[PDB]
């Protein structure tokens, strides 16, 4: 609720120190690894007979 | 019937890949033996449940290569005198546990033919089974698709590798022109593929380095070791098929060794 029952106004909610840029650089560096460990792994399946496109 | 038998079609393949001969000949044997894939038989005055000993003999009439079965011929000749009848023959047949005897020693079964006729008998049988298989691929204009001529290799090799399996499929991209493969340009190759055992031997110096001799003298040294000529295009698709590493050549681990161990 925005206001308390007394009629006062709830305090300022707390963000986290420009976290938007903090998260934005924890998603992408773990997103780039997403490309690698996929491509590397699929190519690793060319080494054997488990799968092929 | 999509998934009805694509288990047994692989299972019977797996049986024919490596399994015990007991059920293998239980599929009667009179002429059902042609199931060994997936005009001699007109001369097969056989008896339906013939044997499995002869069966062991039979596949070896296709398994043993050219120069080696001469020794099997010699080993067959423990009586010497260039001739051996059923006495030694049917005995070593019994140690595992008829038409061929009527075809070799006559319907009388006693008149001992020259066992030198072991070769020609081995010659036509290797031809006929190869012949009947050539019709199983429905030769159009007496010729079959390069993916069929390559397919039978896989059917011959009997290996489970998805890559080269797909390479067999992808060949129409590598060969979209279309030439068709005749029964002679494939029979000569198998006679070579029969005597593989000596090729790698003769190829040992190359084997000390590799590359399986650039696909052309390969065909040349083939005729030397195989005593039979091949064309150029016939082997180009084979090098195009088995070029798993994409190098444009073969390692022993690419094509030859797999053939060598196939003689199990």
């Amino acid at each position: 609720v925005i206001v308390t029952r007394s009629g006062a106004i709830l305090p300022k909610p707390v963000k986290m120190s420009f976290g938007l840029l903090r998260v934005f650089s924890i998603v992408i560096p773990f997103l780039y690894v997403g490309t690698l460990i996929s491509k590397n792994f699929a190519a690793l399946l060319e080494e054997h007979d488990i799968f092929v496109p | 019937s999509g998934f009805r038998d694509r288990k047994v079609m692989e299972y019977e393949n797996r049986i024919r890949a490596y399994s015990t001969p007991d059920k293998i000949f239980r599929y009667f044997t009179p002429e059902d033996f042609v199931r060994s894939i997936t005009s001699i038989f007109y001369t097969l005055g056989e008896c339906g449940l013939i044997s499995f000993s002869d069966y062991i003999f039979l596949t070896t009439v296709l398994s043993t290569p050219q120069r080696n079965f001469e020794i099997a011929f010699k080993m067959f000749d423990l009586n010497g005198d260039g001739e051996v009848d059923m006495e030694e023959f049917e005995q070593v047949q019994s140690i595992i546990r008829s038409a061929l005897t009527t075809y070799f020693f006559g319907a009388d079964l006693k008149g001992k033919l020259t066992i030198k006729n072991f070769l020609e008998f081995q010659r036509k049988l290797q031809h006929d089974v190869l012949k009947l298989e050539f019709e199983r691929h429905d030769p159009v204009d007496g010729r079959i698709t390069e993916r069929q001529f390559g397919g039978m290799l896989l059917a011959y090799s009997g290996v489970q590798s998805k890559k080269l399996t797909a390479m067999q499929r992808q060949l129409k991209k590598h060969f979209k022109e279309g030439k068709g493969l005749t029964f002679q340009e494939v029979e000569n190759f198998f006679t070579f593929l029969k005597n593989i055992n000596d090729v790698d031997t003769a190829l040992s110096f190359y084997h000390m380095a590799g590359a399986s001799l650039d696909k052309v003298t390969m065909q040349q040294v083939a005729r030397t070791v195989a005593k039979v000529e091949l064309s150029d295009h016939v082997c180009d698709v084979v090098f195009a098929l088995f070029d798993c590493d994409g190098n444009g050549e073969l390692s022993n681990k690419e094509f030859v060794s797999i053939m060598k161990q196939r003689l199990m």
Side-chain angles (χ1 to χ4, degrees), chain A, chain B residues 1-172 174-175 177-252 254-263:
Chain A
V1 198
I2 170 64
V3 300
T4 184
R5 59 186 192 91
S6 158
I9 285 186
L10 266 72
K12 186 185 181 73
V14 53
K15 316 186 292 183
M16 45 179 317
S17 66
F18 284 166
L20 177 48
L21 274 299
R22 180 149 54 260
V23 58
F24 212 67
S25 287
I26 293 303
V27 55
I28 292 170
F30 285 98
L31 187 45
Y32 177 84
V33 176
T35 78
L36 298 202
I37 193 172
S38 88
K39 166 256 289 185
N40 165 42
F41 190 80
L44 185 134
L45 275 190
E46 294 293 328
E47 286 190 356
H48 297 69
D49 49 346
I50 293 284
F51 194 75
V52 57
Chain B
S1 309
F3 206 75
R4 293 321 304 351
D5 311 285
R6 305 318 96 80
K7 177 162 187 169
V8 312
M9 289 310 182
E10 269 54 40
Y11 192 45
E12 305 279 358
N13 267 302
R14 177 154 155 259
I15 313 166
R16 287 145 30 214
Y18 196 62
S19 63
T20 173
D22 165 65
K23 178 64 175 192
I24 287 178
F25 81 94
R26 201 256 169 190
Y27 293 116
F28 70 100
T29 314
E31 86 289 350
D32 306 333
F33 155 73
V34 193
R35 72 162 285 281
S36 87
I37 294 305
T38 293
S39 198
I40 292 177
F41 300 92
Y42 300 152
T43 74
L44 259 287
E46 48 86 26
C47 316
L49 184 76
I50 326 172
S51 176
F52 52 96
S53 53
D54 61 350
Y55 191 96
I56 302 146
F57 162 81
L58 278 150
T59 128
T60 54
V61 193
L62 187 45
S63 296
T64 299
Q66 163 59 29
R67 63 140 176 76
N68 195 300
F69 81 85
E70 311 168 324
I71 303 301
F73 171 34
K74 290 283 193 177
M75 186 277 288
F76 180 87
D77 209 34
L78 293 196
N79 184 44
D81 71 89
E83 263 196 22
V84 159
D85 204 351
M86 56 90 59
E87 321 91 354
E88 307 180 345
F89 172 43
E90 281 283 354
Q91 171 57 40
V92 311
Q93 297 328 295
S94 87
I95 71 185
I96 181 57
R97 76 208 319 268
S98 84
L100 71 163
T101 79
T102 78
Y103 183 52
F104 275 162
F105 314 104
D108 64 312
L109 184 154
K110 317 302 165 182
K112 206 197 307 207
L113 83 169
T114 192
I115 317 296
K116 188 261 150 182
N117 307 155
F118 193 94
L119 187 148
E120 313 83 312
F121 169 78
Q122 202 280 336
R123 294 294 88 193
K124 195 170 183 289
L125 177 53
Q126 165 190 4
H127 177 274
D128 194 14
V129 166
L130 177 55
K131 171 50 50 184
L132 188 155
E133 174 56 21
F134 202 71
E135 274 96 8
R136 187 178 184 271
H137 279 281
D138 307 65
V140 307
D141 189 9
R143 293 194 156 269
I144 76 177
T145 82
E146 53 273 13
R147 278 179 71 246
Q148 281 202 129
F149 157 72
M152 39 176 60
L153 310 191
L154 272 303
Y156 177 91
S157 296
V159 310
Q160 314 314 127
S161 157
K162 268 71 165 188
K163 196 201 308 184
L164 50 83
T165 310
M167 299 305 301
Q168 193 272 345
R169 189 149 295 273
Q170 192 63 254
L171 163 62
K172 277 179 183 180
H174 273 280
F175 263 76
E177 46 277 41
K179 265 192 51 192
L181 274 300
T182 178
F183 179 73
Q184 207 47 44
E185 280 303 322
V186 71
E187 184 169 15
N188 53 7
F189 186 95
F190 286 174
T191 41
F192 156 87
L193 175 74
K194 288 315 289 285
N195 302 139
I196 41 166
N197 200 17
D198 310 342
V199 191
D200 176 54
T201 293
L203 204 56
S204 45
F205 179 59
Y206 294 74
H207 182 274
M208 278 307 166
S212 199
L213 78 171
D214 71 6
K215 184 254 286 182
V216 288
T217 176
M218 201 284 309
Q219 202 277 291
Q220 162 265 308
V221 307
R223 188 267 325 280
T224 74
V225 62
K227 268 70 64 185
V228 58
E229 190 45 290
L230 325 181
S231 69
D232 177 28
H233 155 262
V234 60
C235 277
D236 311 344
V237 309
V238 191
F239 267 67
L241 193 147
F242 295 92
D243 186 19
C244 306
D245 56 348
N247 72 333
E249 305 81 44
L250 318 171
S251 88
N252 181 28
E254 273 186 71
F255 150 73
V256 175
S257 48
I258 302 102
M259 298 313 185
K260 191 163 205 74
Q261 54 81 27
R262 185 261 190 283
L263 293 180

